[PDB]
Write a protein that binds this ligand. Sequence first.
Ligand SMILES: CCCCCCCCCCCCCCCCCCCC(=O)O[C@H](COC(=O)CCCCCCCCCCCCCC)COP(=O)(O)OCCN
Ligand SMILES: CCCCCCCCCCCCO[C@@H]1O[C@H](CO)[C@@H](O[C@H]2O[C@H](CO)[C@@H](O)[C@H](O)[C@H]2O)[C@H](O)[C@H]1O
Ligand SMILES: CCCCCCCCCCCCO[C@H]1O[C@H](CO)[C@@H](O[C@H]2O[C@H](CO)[C@@H](O)[C@H](O)[C@H]2O)[C@H](O)[C@H]1O
Ligand SMILES: CN(C)c1ccc(O)c2c1C[C@H]1C[C@H]3[C@H](N(C)C)C(O)=C(C(N)=O)C(=O)[C@@]3(O)C(O)=C1C2=O
Ligand SMILES: CCCCCCCCCCCCCCCC(=O)OC[C@H](O)COP(=O)(O)OCCN
Ligand SMILES: CCCCCCCCCC(=O)OC[C@H](CO)OC(=O)CCCCCCCCC
Ligand SMILES: CCCCCCCCCCCCCC
Ligand SMILES: CCCCCCCCCC[N+](C)(C)[O-]
Ligand SMILES: CCCCCCCCCCCC
Ligand SMILES: CCCCCCCCCC
Ligand SMILES: CCCCCCCCCC
Ligand SMILES: CCCCCCCC
Ligand SMILES: CCCCCC
Ligand SMILES: CCCCCC
Ligand SMILES: [Cl-]
Ligand code: NA
Lengths: 156, 1034, 144, 48, 48, 48
Amino acid sequence: GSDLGKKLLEAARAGRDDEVRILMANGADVNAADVVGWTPLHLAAYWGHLEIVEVLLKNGADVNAYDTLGSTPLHLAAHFGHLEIVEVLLKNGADVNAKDDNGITPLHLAANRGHLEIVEVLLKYGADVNAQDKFGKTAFDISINNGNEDLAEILQ
Amino acid sequence: MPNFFIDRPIFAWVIAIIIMLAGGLAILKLPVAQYPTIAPPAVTISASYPGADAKTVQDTVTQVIEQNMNGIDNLMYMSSNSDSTGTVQITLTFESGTDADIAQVQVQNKLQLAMPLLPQEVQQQGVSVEKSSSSFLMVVGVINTDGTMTQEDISDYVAANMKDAISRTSGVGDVQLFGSQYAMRIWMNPNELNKFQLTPVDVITAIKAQNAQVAAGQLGGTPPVKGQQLNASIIAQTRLTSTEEFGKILLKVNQDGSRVLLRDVAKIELGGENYDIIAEFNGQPASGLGIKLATGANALDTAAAIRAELAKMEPFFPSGLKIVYPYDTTPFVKISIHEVVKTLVEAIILVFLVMYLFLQNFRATLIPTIAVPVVLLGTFAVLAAFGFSINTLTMFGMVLAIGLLVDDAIVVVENVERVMAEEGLPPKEATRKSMGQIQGALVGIAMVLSAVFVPMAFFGGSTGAIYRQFSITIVSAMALSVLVALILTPALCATMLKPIAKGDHGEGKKGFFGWFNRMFEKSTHHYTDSVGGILRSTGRYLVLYLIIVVGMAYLFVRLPSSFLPDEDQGVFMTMVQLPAGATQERTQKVLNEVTHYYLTKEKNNVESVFAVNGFGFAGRPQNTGIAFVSLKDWADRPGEENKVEAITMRATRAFSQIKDAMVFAFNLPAIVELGTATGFDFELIDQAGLGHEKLTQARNQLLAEAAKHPDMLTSVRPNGLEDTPQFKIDIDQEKAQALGVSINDINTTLGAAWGGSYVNDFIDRGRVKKVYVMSEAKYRMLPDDIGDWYVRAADGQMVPFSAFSSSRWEYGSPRLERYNGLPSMEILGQAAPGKSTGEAMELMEQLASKLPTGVGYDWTGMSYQERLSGNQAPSLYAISLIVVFLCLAALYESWSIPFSVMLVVPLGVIGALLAATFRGLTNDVYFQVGLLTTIGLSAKNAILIVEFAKDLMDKEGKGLIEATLDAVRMRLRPILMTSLAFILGVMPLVISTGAGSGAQNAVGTGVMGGMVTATVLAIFFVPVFFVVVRRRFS
Amino acid sequence: TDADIAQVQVQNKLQLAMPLLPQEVQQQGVSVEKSSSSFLMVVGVINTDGTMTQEDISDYVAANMKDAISRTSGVGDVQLFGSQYAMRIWMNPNELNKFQLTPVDVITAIKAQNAQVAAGQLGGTPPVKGQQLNASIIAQTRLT
Amino acid sequence: GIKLATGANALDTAAAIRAELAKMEPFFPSGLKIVYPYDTTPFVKISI
Amino acid sequence: PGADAKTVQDTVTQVIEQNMNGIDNLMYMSSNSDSTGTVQITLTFESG
Amino acid sequence: ERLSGNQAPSLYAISLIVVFLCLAALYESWSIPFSVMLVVPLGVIGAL
Ligand SMILES: CCCCCCCCCCCCCCCCCCCC(=O)O[C@H](COC(=O)CCCCCCCCCCCCCC)COP(=O)(O)OCCN
Ligand SMILES: CCCCCCCCCCCCO[C@@H]1O[C@H](CO)[C@@H](O[C@H]2O[C@H](CO)[C@@H](O)[C@H](O)[C@H]2O)[C@H](O)[C@H]1O
Ligand SMILES: CCCCCCCCCCCCO[C@H]1O[C@H](CO)[C@@H](O[C@H]2O[C@H](CO)[C@@H](O)[C@H](O)[C@H]2O)[C@H](O)[C@H]1O
Ligand SMILES: CN(C)c1ccc(O)c2c1C[C@H]1C[C@H]3[C@H](N(C)C)C(O)=C(C(N)=O)C(=O)[C@@]3(O)C(O)=C1C2=O
Ligand SMILES: CCCCCCCCCCCCCCCC(=O)OC[C@H](O)COP(=O)(O)OCCN
Ligand SMILES: CCCCCCCCCC(=O)OC[C@H](CO)OC(=O)CCCCCCCCC
Ligand SMILES: CCCCCCCCCCCCCC
Ligand SMILES: CCCCCCCCCC[N+](C)(C)[O-]
Ligand SMILES: CCCCCCCCCCCC
Ligand SMILES: CCCCCCCCCC
Ligand SMILES: CCCCCCCCCC
Ligand SMILES: CCCCCCCC
Ligand SMILES: CCCCCC
Ligand SMILES: CCCCCC
Ligand SMILES: [Cl-]
Ligand code: NA
């Protein structure tokens, strides 16, 4: 962990586009990670900062970087309903079937929070609809348990 | 009335004697404290939820209590903190003048009815309702030097053998332990628990069974069988008393018949209730007592009594234990008293010298030497009657009134000495005529000065309570001075002064006093010639007056505003702030570096560093700490370079090097509740259930905009904490039910192990203390450790936590704030250099009206009080000016002549502003009260010039210029005498650099400069004012 | 009679009775008030558009207005002309019997699965040497 | 339905209620509006 | 209920008594703890 | 009882001083007061 690495983590989180720009020019470590294993891309994905997700990927950020529990930026973006960031991550080669330590995928998380637009995008980029978590649950099992009629019909 | 007492000097002496005894009695019985109660009454509700996060605390404790704080009288506002230390503090602030006891009992009564709605673990810990205050009398440190005791061991010894005795000590109002009494700590091992198919649930169940009080009954209890001879109580099971007994608690009997005891699955020791704080004093383990002074108590007596009780405890102290006094106010308060008594005594000595220099007889010098003490003693008797204390504000209030008290004495005696010299009348007849000339004016002056000072007592809020201390002190001293001037002083003059033959001005004397009288008589003719010339060309002086008025107005706007000067109190604070999520050990390494700096780079200045790791003022997570620095005595720190302000700046500059840690030193404020000079306290409020995240975005939007106006706003930051990574674990209900694992067993196992659990009480050497079960550190540090905790299913199989749970990283708040029941975020800031708080607040309001839908705002603390204190000022200034005018109108029997007196105001103010500006001081409370007394004395000088002038025109039919010239001639000597005595009297306060010099400098500087100009200008300008005002109106 | 002291004396005695009262009565909150029997005023709340039902308005008043009015000095008592929203579980006895469940089972489950658990911390005090991670553990939270 | 606290001033309390309602109005949902169907204080104010 | 005088003193009487400090006009405090579990703490205040 | 006895001397002392000062004021004399106040022992011995 470097001085500019810490500055980039804080800037990526806060959504300060202009500060990230200056930090990219000075070569702030894009693979900088905090104690839980979150990169600037993780943080930008979580808090929904589209411009910074794009700028970090341009500057050779790991699109499939995983935290200490095996969660990727696509997991975060899919879970918190950031449609534009999900599309960008998938276009820059994000593993659509990425499994965390619980066996949970972006499709599982999106299904759980009922993000219909995101579920369609994930399925479009070839998300495994039959993918089971550690409890043997699919995105379909989540849709019927949540009682989401629209979602259950799409996961046919 | 003066005539009455000239013929009755014994009656006069009797009145002086009664006043002296009343004052003498008051001096002995009057309370003593550094500062009186200023801040409006506040009641704090405090609750602990062991192992609870900010949201859990907020949504199960804080919201329920807040919803039940209804039907309570005189509530201004309500604010709360819920943080991830498992702590809630709700603060209810009440209208100034509210009974603090009624406020507290009303709050705790409404809480009592809300207690059944709180979680069982919160009801078990309890919910404290306390009168809020931050002023400690002193902090007693208790350390161990031979390395045989931890902070936990010292805390328990202090709690068991010291705290109660100090609480019982005379004048002690409250005592806070810096630590807890011991708890029985059961440190659980999950490997051993799983080995014998046991969980924390079984540990808790066994402790409640085998550590308990059990009711039995009596032998031969009523109603008995008739003939029963013996009646005795049956004692059954009573609470355990030792780590040995807790160790032997039976958990399981195995198939083969071997016993599983609690010591087989846990480490068992006496430890602290909490491990959040790590206290060190010069690197050595430390506890201590925070002692507050009781209402109406004498601070000096209490401090002596505390040290007397600590002395009695010395012989029983375990080896290595030692008392230290890192903070004690009473040395400072003792120096304040000494310095004030010194100033009042020097003032009386200087009046004696000036009185002899001019009047040159010892009988004259004795009259003020009697009169001034009588007034000062009388003033204490009236303070006592109003229920005031001898404090910094009331003591310096008397110092600021010295000029007014000295003048009343000098005016009466000097005028008798003149009347005798000019007319040849004997003392008694001379005193009658002399009082005849001034007695009407003295009463007029009393009413005018009442009109000036009395309205100062009716400002609301904290600043009002401060101004009220000076107002009553000064009005009382002034009021008694006039009573003594009309009763005692005339009687003393009539009976003590020797006659002076008509024409004898001591010009015929030899030596210094002959030369002086010749010089001063010659100087008086030079003065009357100058006024003669000034009065021939009054036009250019009205021009010079407006230049002064404009210069005054200009200097007023440029002079930075403040409350009370910073002081060298031999102590200051160092703040240690690490990045969010930083651990206790990382914070400890920075504090070790900060402590090492002070005992190395400032070994000459620093006596001790009190390092409190895991303590902050806006939340106490693991990434925060403070170093409380105590300095060596003032005597051993000579020069400005070795004072708190210089050490502070040096420390801050050195520590700015420290990487990944915000560290800075700062002096303590005079009174904490007033806040910073032109600071504001803003609340951003969620008014439409937006939630934490949308309110954060709104906060950032406001902060971003505030940063774009550095011309108006400076250091606009949040007071709270930023969201941090947290470990969300989801229990799969289906998997739990499938394996036959109850959710109670899962939630207890997790909570008990990782969070800790208060089970019940035991009795340690005759003292009831708490029993906590918790995981030993090494099994609750990292996410992988979650899988090492097992829960027994219905069928008896041990199921790991991994089998029925899933986890992920998310962000959440470690401290959630609420204002008047709604989610809030406190924003601090201050007006830019040259800008007023009003302007800064006006912009913040403008910026706030541009935030998203459902985001409101309010002002709190100093900002709430400023809005309500600022709106009163115009009314109080107006009432003061109107009543002054009306009193002078009644005195002079004229609507016009009053203006000639009132025009003097700027002549004093200009000198005060020049002296303050030049010396680099601020427009503070001491300076402001200084202006009123300077205005007061110059007004008094002017009143008597105009009375003498007007009387000569009315009675002796003299001309305007003739009357004015004869008036200023007669008033020259008394005006110069008062000014020479008083200026010399405040000279020590101006040059002072010792302890309490900040206050002395603030009192002295403005008064000295103000008196210099007030004296020099008024003697030339008052005659101009009178001539111009008489000409313009007939 | 000083109404403050009357209330204080009445409540000191009530607190002796409180623990003997049924737990259902304790949990509804017992209130002690010093007010007139008559209404000072009635503050009415309507929706001129007609976007909100009687029940929706009553909830808004209860959740956003009542508390701040109730804390205002001189307000001795505040009566809501309506009800704050609760989570209503309207049970069906045919379906409960069909799955061999009772209201007791329903209540047990709601207490078990609508819980706010204190779960402690990773790297919480007292910690081991060299600990770098310090994070709150978040388990079950209240259902929304 | 608001009842006056024992010994409290009706008019001062009514003013404080109105001032607190004034702070809530700006954050109301669309259509929601305060009406004053029963107030005993206006008569006291007007009759004096 | 059921607690001896010593038990009652340690768990109740001393707990209450060590909080009966910083009260205005307190002349003296007396207390008894008995075998039936009963505590009585009388605080006598100055005249007036 | 301890309080009553402890404060009695100061009560007599202040009472004598007040009566003296009152007499000094009313009769514009020190001699009349001193002359009168010497009578007090003549009364007090009879009471004892
Ligand atoms: C606050 C509002 C609330 C309501 C309060 C109501 C009461 C208001 C105060 C009442 C004051 C009125 C005074 C009455 C005096 C009557 C005596 C008339 C005779 C006379 O010439 O006065 C001599 C004294 O005055 C003198 O010789 C004095 C010198 C001349 C005037 C001096 C002016 C005093 C200073 C004014 C300060 C401003 C005050 C503002 C309120 C006494 O002569 P004698 O009768 O004993 O002789 C024997 C003759 N046979
Ligand atoms: C930095 C401090 C500055 C403070 C401001 C200065 C004001 C205080 C000093 C006053 C000094 C007065 O000094 C006085 O001035 C007047 C000017 O009108 C002189 O008067 C002179 O001019 C007038 C007008 O033409 C003639 O009538 C007169 O015969 C002549 O002597 C006096 O002879 C002189 O003694
Ligand atoms: C045992 C004695 C207890 C004393 C309690 C002290 C209370 C202080 C709590 C707040 C500390 C947090 O720090 C914050 O408040 C300080 C108040 O002292 C501010 O300090 C401010 O006021 C001081 C008044 O003496 C000035 O000397 C500083 O120049 C000024 O900046 C800091 O700029 C700010 O960073
Ligand atoms: C903030 N304060 C002045 C100090 C200073 C030095 C200290 O060494 C300590 C404190 C606060 C006190 C608060 C007390 C509190 N109480 C009086 C028991 C307390 O309940 C807690 C707590 N975390 O709840 C403590 O940490 C505490 O035990 C503690 O360890 C402290 C402590 O050790
Ligand atoms: C604390 C108690 C206060 C009592 C004060 C008593 C007054 C004296 C105090 C002692 C100071 C020393 C000098 C005092 C002289 C003093 O009081 O006595 C002088 C003569 O007794 C006067 O006699 P008299 O003929 O009545 O004269 C009156 C003229 N009309
Ligand atoms: C003789 C005429 C004196 C009139 C001035 C008296 C004003 C005092 C009003 C008051 O009670 O407020 C006290 C206030 C509290 O902060 O103390 C002060 O701040 C001092 C105010 C000095 C103002 C100088 C006026 C110059 C232009 C005329
Ligand atoms: C002798 C001086 C009396 C002073 C009384 C001051 C009372 C004025 C009240 C100020 C508040 C007005 C707000 C508009
Ligand atoms: C401490 C009180 C001292 C009182 C002494 C005053 C004596 C006054 C006598 C004056 N005389 C009547 C003789 O003129
Ligand atoms: C607020 C009232 C101020 C009083 C002013 C009275 C002035 C009267 C002038 C009469 C001129 C003849
Ligand atoms: C708030 C009360 C103010 C009253 C001030 C009166 C002072 C008179 C002293 C003699
Ligand atoms: C030429 C200016 C004369 C001024 C002299 C004033 C004398 C004042 C003595 C106190
Ligand atoms: C026992 C302390 C007395 C201090 C008196 C101070 C007088 C200004
Ligand atoms: C004649 C003097 C008047 C004094 C009243 C206070
Ligand atoms: C009790 C002694 C009184 C005597 C006064 C002269
Ligand atoms: Cl002499
Ligand atoms: Na539970």
